[model samples]
Target: HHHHHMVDEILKLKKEKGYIILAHNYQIPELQDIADFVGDSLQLARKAMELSEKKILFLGVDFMAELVKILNPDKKVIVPDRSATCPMANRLTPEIIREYREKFPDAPVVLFVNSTSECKTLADVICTSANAVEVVKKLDSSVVIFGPDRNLGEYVAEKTGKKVITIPENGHCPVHQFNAESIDAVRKKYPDAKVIVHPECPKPVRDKADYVGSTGQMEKIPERDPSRIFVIGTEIGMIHKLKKKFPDREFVPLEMAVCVNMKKNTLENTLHALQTESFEVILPKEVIEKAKKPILRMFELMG
Candidate 1:
């Protein structure tokens, strides 16, 4: 097992290569432990602007890596696996957004940060699972067009009390499509466990949850609670981190919700990524400039 040695080399490479690795919450647990810093995608983009490091190796999917690259066109951004993908990213295209925007000219568009760089360019501002409610509430429009994940849009609309236009054709994360019966079964098995689900989950699942929050928010539950048993409703990989965080607590996966793409980045591959920078995330100069406009607009609005 190169467990210790692999991470040792990664530490050496990060410091020597003048780069930092940023991981998303959806990545494999091993990657979460080894990444230079770990958080949500939008958080990584903001960190990219603040850090002196010249390179950013994103361990998540292409959309996330592209987000970092789009914001810093001049900076070197890399991914461990260039093919690491998020299905939700493919659902919304620039043409689709242009059509929707034309149809609802008066309404503001809140593109989920899971979108491709081109899609984000059309947004009034971008949002993440962590800040969807805040972003929607902060926007000036009363009726907003939210997309790609209708479940997430609905959740945001409910929490913020806005008239949100959710695109039916837009795709969703299969991980969040847990059967209510599966959750029901787990609850009965572990009567004491409290249920906390991610907002991307279906309305039925969310309704059953004792708490509903983003990946980061779910991470905080076991830490804050006194319970020894906890039922989590996000990705299966999250249990790894939660278990590591609260070792004494028994963490149970609501279901095995794995993102196949996230498993593409291995510890060894991550080390190679830092060394060779082979899988660099490069976008067209014009695409970079256009994509970044709304992301900057988002930060300004967040303030």
Candidate 2:
């Protein structure tokens, strides 16, 4: 495989065709290297809103691309692999959301941004892992219905002191379920390393971690903390992201955690997506209208 040739063409097509490439931190290093910008799903989508470009090649799972499409309805958005999607998000169905709403009655439905567009349409607000605590805290209700990631829901409940009724009971990101023993081993090996884990991790892992944050927040730790070595506790892709940003410091994985769906977007498929411009991310007008409301509400509350 001629890797440089692929990189050259990918860069060439993006410029010639006027496309802004947005990638998630969970993307492979190859895809991340070629991307115009790489960040978390909400960060990438928000970046899309700020940019002047009309055409976009989103390099992540389907739910994220749908978010970009929902936010920038007039812009053209395409993905490398439409099938690449978050399984944890898929676990929480619209029917389940309806059932929860009826039971909670007064509790607001706060859907994680990892969710499907249909679920977003039904949510009272959309929150990313970075802002989940703040979003739930601002809500008037003492009890809120959160979903798509049970660990994150629990973390939010702990942080905001709210009753978070996480839907689909066991919904969680498989990649972040690091064993606490891994942290113990890493600590023993790298005595100076700071153990930074994602909030989506199980309770033991989160409790044992030196710091708990989202990928976006994790990126900022190195700036202020100045740790020589950091044991990252998210997906393996994030290891690349951290290393690129702070090459001088060491970035070690808590475990070889991989999100297979995120890895679906490769160099070959990304180049093909640029060439063909097929598989545009499209959502119904009604869905877009409803989805945007909760997303916009998130902004308003933050302001």
Best by lDDT: 2
Q: Model 2 compared with the native: what TM-score? A: 0.98
- Collision count for each candidate, in order: 0, 0
How would you encode candidate 2's per-residue C-alpha lDDT over 165-202 as one tens digit per residue? 99997998988888999999998999999999999999
Top candidate when judged by TM-score against the true structure: 2
The local lDDT score (0 to 100) that residue 265 gets in candidate 1 is 89
> What would the C-alpha RMSD of candidate 1 be, to one decimal place?
1.8
Name model 1 segments beyond 4 Å from true: 2-5, 168-170
Q: Assess every candidate by TM-score.
A: 0.93, 0.98
Clashes of 2: 0
Q: Please give the distance, in angstroms, between residue 302's alpha carbon in candidate 1 and its true position after superposition.
A: 2.7
**Model 1 pairs in collision:** none
Which 10-residue window of candidate 2 scores lowest in summed lDDT?
A: 40-49
